[PDB]
């Protein structure tokens with residue numbers, strides 16, 4: 236309800252394109268297919284590329300009025316980015332080649348032509364209607380059944396964010412909408428229908444095209460969160476380590492997260508190994524992604540407060556923790572023998588990123604075990620955790636460059652490892668964390684923060700963890716600067732979609748993703764690139780869930796130089812909201828709402844005064860902090 240005007244999601248599921256972008260050949264009244272009136276008559280070989288304004292998804296229907304020849308055809312091509320607009324092909328989903336247009340033999344007669352959900356286009360902003368025959372074809376409409384997020388009201392958000400910075404607001408809502416697009420009907424999964432047949436080492440020529448379909452049921456239930464709407468349309472655990480919290484503070488569609496998580500845990504091996512991806516992707520060993528599955532279960536319990544779910548899955552979670560701990564060696568660090576990660580290079584040995592994620596997982600597991608009163612596993616865990624810290628900063632810390640090396644035998648400093656080490660509290664001091672934040676920011680290029688472990692690549696995925704690291708190191712304006720630089724490029728570059736966020740690109744500002752050779756296959760709607768949504772709600776607005784469903788919370792707004800911030804979301808316990816206005820580095824007004832029955836703490840920084848409750852309770856701030864605050868509405872006096 237609040238700030239609904241920023242919500243990108245369509246107001247219906249019956250969608251005509253918004254505007255005509257380009258016309259080729261004799262075409263009468265192309266604007267008719269935008270709902271502007273009349274019918275559109277294609278006279279011979281012709282085409283019209285239409286623009287929807289935003290990235291959309293679903294099932295195309297061609298309403299034909301007449302066709303002069305029995306051999307007439309109408310084709311439809313789709314593309315996320317405008318650089319792959321073509322009257323001959325879509326953009327790519329497979330490892331090599333462009334996808335074939337959807338061809339309708341409309342030479343029969345009048346009626347609506349469709350091939351249903353088997354050929355759902357998972358994501359596209361531009362749609363080209365093509366007549367490749369000398370026939371005259373009149374069409375009444377070409378519309379889309381919008382099938383992204385199938386069991387929800389697309390414009391009924393439970394979270395919101397609005398600041399004095401309009402770019403930040405648009406970035407928040409673009410992340411939320413991206414997540415909506417990646418929630419699919421589970422019966423239309425697996426866009427990689429050519430896995431095994433089409434590989435990177437191949438060439439599909441200009442007249443050659445890839446066939447595509449969507450008919451693998453990837454989860455149970457009626458909705459699930461995938462990595463990318465166009466592609467892979469599969470469940471990936473690492474992507475959830477950014478996507479879950481951004482879903483939780485905007486749409487609250489944690490049911491799709493839950494189906495994805497359950498499908499992943501259903502693939503656990505007897506020894507506890509969790510999968511690299513959901514079915515039918517290759518059974519692959521990946522340390523880090525197994526740990527991401529553990530992270531995801533922990534965060535799901537944190538936001539839903541589902542005791543029954545955690546109880547169902549605690550045995551599997553402990554088995555996974557045991558599997559990961561089996562990699563720890565005499566050193567006290569995990570020695571990673573699997574190279575598979577987020578499509579980066581050099582995963583192995585005493586990798587800083589793997590061990591930081593392990594530290595994070597261990598602390599998650601201890602807090603969960605205390606929630607469940609399962610004290611037995613705690614000891615080992617604590618000890619192991621300590622060792623990681625103690626050894627990771629002795630054998631991996633580079634004091635001269637202010638960052639962690641990737642392992643013991645390299646001078647490379649990975650962005651993911653250092654970001655995660657700050658996010659997991661692997662550093663021995665806040666001063667260290669500030670060094671890491673400063674040194675990461677020192678590496679920014681004209682198009683955002685680099686990930687040297689994956690070559691000349693910018694990763695919005697790792698950008699989300701770096702944002703969190705800048706925040707936890709006490710640098711909110713550094714984080715807002717990275718937001719502006721990287722995500723304003725992702726949102727406002729004319730090749731982007733202006734609604735959804737890219738999977739990754741290159742440091743020179745090109746849309747080359749190094750792991751892929753088929754550049755049209757990069758997805759422009761990946762949930763793992765939506766870090767700013769959760770970051771702006773949690774850190775800028777200061778609404779931090781610290782207990783199940785917000786049973787306990789921390790209010791720590793890190794405003795920086797923003798002069799006005801409003802944000803809010805809900806859990807099954809009630810409403811969280813934060814609202815403040817500043818000027819000259821001081822709060823003019825500050826208020827926040829937390830659900831009843833909850834208790835929390837406050838941390839405003841260098842702020843002195845009283846917090847007044849709705850009833851009238853007054854609490855003095857000591858060092859900008861206060862604890863034991865009872866749930867409700869609070870204002871700063």
Ligand SMILES: *[C@@H]1O[C@H](CO)[C@@H](O[C@@H]2O[C@H](CO)[C@@H](O[C@@H]3O[C@H](CO[C@H]4O[C@H](CO)[C@@H](O)[C@H](O)[C@@H]4O)[C@@H](O)[C@H](O[C@H]4O[C@H](CO)[C@@H](O)[C@H](O)[C@@H]4O)[C@@H]3O)[C@H](O)[C@H]2NC(C)=O)[C@H](O)[C@H]1NC(C)=O
Pocket residue numbers: 448450451
């Ligand atoms: C998702 O969509 C894809 C299509 O894009 C489907 O893939 C096809 O699935 C069919 C199964 O339905 C595959 O099998 C083909 O069946 C044809 C019929 O053969 C007999 O099948 C029954 C079996 O009991 C007989 O009783 C009956 O009399 C039929 O005669 C065969 O003619 C096909 O031969 C094909 O074999 C090779 C290897 O598979 C193919 O590559 C060739 O095209 C060749 O013609 C075949 O056996 C078919 O192969 C699949 N095709 C493709 C392109 O993948 C998925 O099934 C569908 N999945 C879901 C869940 O909906």
Ligand SMILES: *[C@@H]1O[C@H](CO)[C@@H](O[C@@H]2O[C@H](CO)[C@@H](O[C@@H]3O[C@H](CO)[C@@H](O)[C@H](O[C@H]4O[C@H](CO)[C@@H](O)[C@H](O)[C@@H]4O)[C@@H]3O)[C@H](O)[C@H]2NC(C)=O)[C@H](O)[C@H]1NC(C)=O
Pocket residue numbers: 574580581582583584641642643644645647688
């Ligand atoms: C400790 O950390 C360092 C730094 O990350 C790490 O060195 C990295 O090792 C990986 C291999 O695990 C290297 O990745 C390969 O490097 C070679 C060049 O030496 C390239 O030719 C490779 O590219 C081709 O091959 C890949 C498959 O093998 C394909 O995926 C790829 O598309 C190419 O076809 C590949 O990049 C990485 O380059 C180095 N790091 C640097 C800076 O070169 C080291 O391995 C870690 N220690 C241990 C024990 O793993």
Ligand SMILES: *[C@@H]1O[C@H](CO)[C@@H](O[C@@H]2O[C@H](CO)[C@@H](O[C@@H]3O[C@H](CO[C@H]4O[C@H](CO)[C@@H](O)[C@H](O)[C@@H]4O)[C@@H](O)[C@H](O)[C@@H]3O)[C@H](O)[C@H]2NC(C)=O)[C@H](O)[C@H]1NC(C)=O
Pocket residue numbers: 248294351352380381382383384385386387388456457
């Ligand atoms: C065009 O696209 C539409 C989707 O965008 C299609 O409508 C969808 O049809 C499916 C079934 O084929 C529905 O999925 C069902 O979901 C219910 C649960 O939903 C109920 O609860 C939720 C949450 O409270 C609520 O939002 C719903 O309104 C329901 O009350 C399951 O129990 C079923 O087993 C089944 O999975 C989708 O809900 C429905 N979409 C919408 C928006 O309602 C439509 O059929 C497509 N048509 C064509 C011709 O392609």
Ligand SMILES: *[C@@H]1O[C@H](CO)[C@@H](O[C@@H]2O[C@H](CO)[C@@H](O[C@@H]3O[C@H](CO)[C@@H](O)[C@H](O)[C@@H]3O)[C@H](O)[C@H]2NC(C)=O)[C@H](O)[C@H]1NC(C)=O
Pocket residue numbers: 257258259282284318320321322323363
């Ligand atoms: C007729 O419509 C097309 C769009 O379908 C207009 O743009 C042209 O589209 C073709 C593809 O059908 C482009 O060719 C391709 O270009 C990309 C790079 O952009 C390249 O990677 C491919 O290998 C292929 O060469 C073509 O460049 C593009 N032209 C322009 C100027 O954008 C076309 O302009 C329309 N014709 C008229 C007369 O309006």
Ligand SMILES: *[C@@H]1O[C@H](CO)[C@@H](O[C@@H]2O[C@H](CO)[C@@H](O[C@@H]3O[C@H](CO)[C@@H](O)[C@H](O)[C@@H]3O)[C@H](O)[C@H]2NC(C)=O)[C@H](O)[C@H]1NC(C)=O
Pocket residue numbers: 308338340367368369
């Ligand atoms: C306009 O586009 C439609 C759809 O692409 C064309 O229909 C297809 O035309 C081909 C001829 O190139 C028909 O022949 C088929 O060729 C494939 C190999 O490419 C072969 O494996 C098949 O056995 C068959 O011989 C194809 O059946 C036909 N497809 C459909 C669904 O009708 C149409 O010819 C184009 N017309 C013009 C004037 O460009």
Ligand SMILES: *[C@@H]1O[C@H](CO)[C@@H](O[C@@H]2O[C@H](CO)[C@@H](O[C@@H]3O[C@H](CO)[C@@H](O)[C@H](O)[C@@H]3O)[C@H](O)[C@H]2NC(C)=O)[C@H](O)[C@H]1NC(C)=O
Pocket residue numbers: 452453454455456514
């Ligand atoms: C949860 O989803 C899974 C699929 O992810 C459901 O199990 C699936 O059941 C279908 C329908 O039986 C299987 O398809 C095949 O059907 C033919 C029909 O003749 C049959 O001969 C095959 O033996 C097979 O049953 C499909 O293979 C199977 N999925 C997998 C991954 O094997 C399940 O029913 C859903 N609901 C739950 C678990 O409550």
Ligand SMILES: *[C@@H]1O[C@H](CO)[C@@H](O[C@@H]2O[C@H](CO)[C@@H](O[C@@H]3O[C@H](CO)[C@@H](O)[C@H](O)[C@@H]3O)[C@H](O)[C@H]2NC(C)=O)[C@H](O)[C@H]1NC(C)=O
Pocket residue numbers: 560561562563564565566567615616619
């Ligand atoms: C408590 O955490 C520690 C980590 O500090 C766990 O220790 C590790 O346990 C695994 C179990 O598989 C050991 O791996 C095994 O190593 C032997 C060689 O010693 C090898 O032959 C096996 O194939 C397997 O790889 C690992 O070495 C060990 N590391 C250390 C430093 O003890 C321990 O498992 C956890 N507690 C429990 C009860 O599991």
Ligand SMILES: *[C@@H]1O[C@H](CO)[C@@H](O[C@@H]2O[C@H](CO)[C@@H](O[C@@H]3O[C@H](CO)[C@@H](O)[C@H](O)[C@@H]3O)[C@H](O)[C@H]2NC(C)=O)[C@H](O)[C@H]1NC(C)=O
Pocket residue numbers: 660661662663664665
């Ligand atoms: C993040 O990690 C830092 C250290 O990297 C944590 O602060 C550190 O807390 C430990 C205790 O957990 C302190 O070590 C010792 O604690 C014993 C009591 O068990 C005490 O008797 C010793 O005098 C010593 O304090 C350590 O000094 C302290 N370091 C700093 C710089 O504060 C911090 O608590 C962690 N933060 C989170 C949110 O987990």
Ligand SMILES: *[C@@H]1O[C@H](CO)[C@@H](O[C@@H]2O[C@H](CO)[C@@H](O[C@@H]3O[C@H](CO)[C@@H](O)[C@H](O)[C@@H]3O)[C@H](O)[C@H]2NC(C)=O)[C@H](O)[C@H]1NC(C)=O
Pocket residue numbers: 712713716795796
């Ligand atoms: C956002 O606004 C602030 C305030 O105008 C910008 O400047 C930063 O302000 C703080 C507080 O005055 C400076 O703190 C420094 O502390 C060290 C401690 O030793 C002291 O030596 C300095 O004299 C100063 O008091 C901080 O250096 C300063 N930073 C800069 C670059 O001016 C801040 O830059 C603004 N950020 C953005 C992105 O707009």
Ligand SMILES: *[C@@H]1O[C@H](CO)[C@@H](O[C@@H]2O[C@H](CO)[C@@H](O[C@@H]3O[C@H](CO)[C@@H](O)[C@H](O)[C@@H]3O)[C@H](O)[C@H]2NC(C)=O)[C@H](O)[C@H]1NC(C)=O
Pocket residue numbers: 288405733
């Ligand atoms: C990419 O998306 C942005 C944001 O949606 C577009 O910028 C413009 O953004 C503002 C809202 O931030 C919209 O303002 C409205 O303009 C209408 C014009 O009639 C006015 O009546 C309203 O009161 C309000 O001021 C504006 O519509 C929007 N422009 C468009 C074209 O959507 C940006 O233009 C988008 N670019 C592309 C190429 O899609």
Ligand SMILES: *[C@@H]1O[C@H](CO)[C@@H](O[C@@H]2O[C@H](CO)[C@@H](O)[C@H](O)[C@H]2NC(C)=O)[C@H](O)[C@H]1NC(C)=O
Pocket residue numbers: 564570571572584
């Ligand atoms: C980490 O594990 C790997 C795999 O078990 C170890 O790699 C082997 O190291 C030995 C020396 O101990 C070499 O002779 C082998 O060639 C290596 N094999 C493989 C498959 O990597 C590595 O030594 C382990 N590192 C630590 C510190 O325990």
Ligand SMILES: *[C@@H]1O[C@H](CO)[C@@H](O[C@@H]2O[C@H](CO)[C@@H](O)[C@H](O)[C@H]2NC(C)=O)[C@H](O)[C@H]1NC(C)=O
Pocket residue numbers: 634635636637666667670
């Ligand atoms: C924060 O800790 C770092 C060490 O990680 C201190 O900076 C280092 O100081 C040593 C002094 O011997 C130098 O050799 C290193 O080059 C410095 N490292 C970096 C990255 O600058 C720093 O002084 C500490 N700051 C505070 C306030 O305690």
Ligand SMILES: *[C@@H]1O[C@H](CO)[C@@H](O)[C@H](O)[C@H]1NC(C)=O
Pocket residue numbers: 831849867868
């Ligand atoms: C819940 O909190 C609201 C204030 O936000 C208050 O009006 C209401 O009475 C509270 N209900 C209970 C049962 O405490």
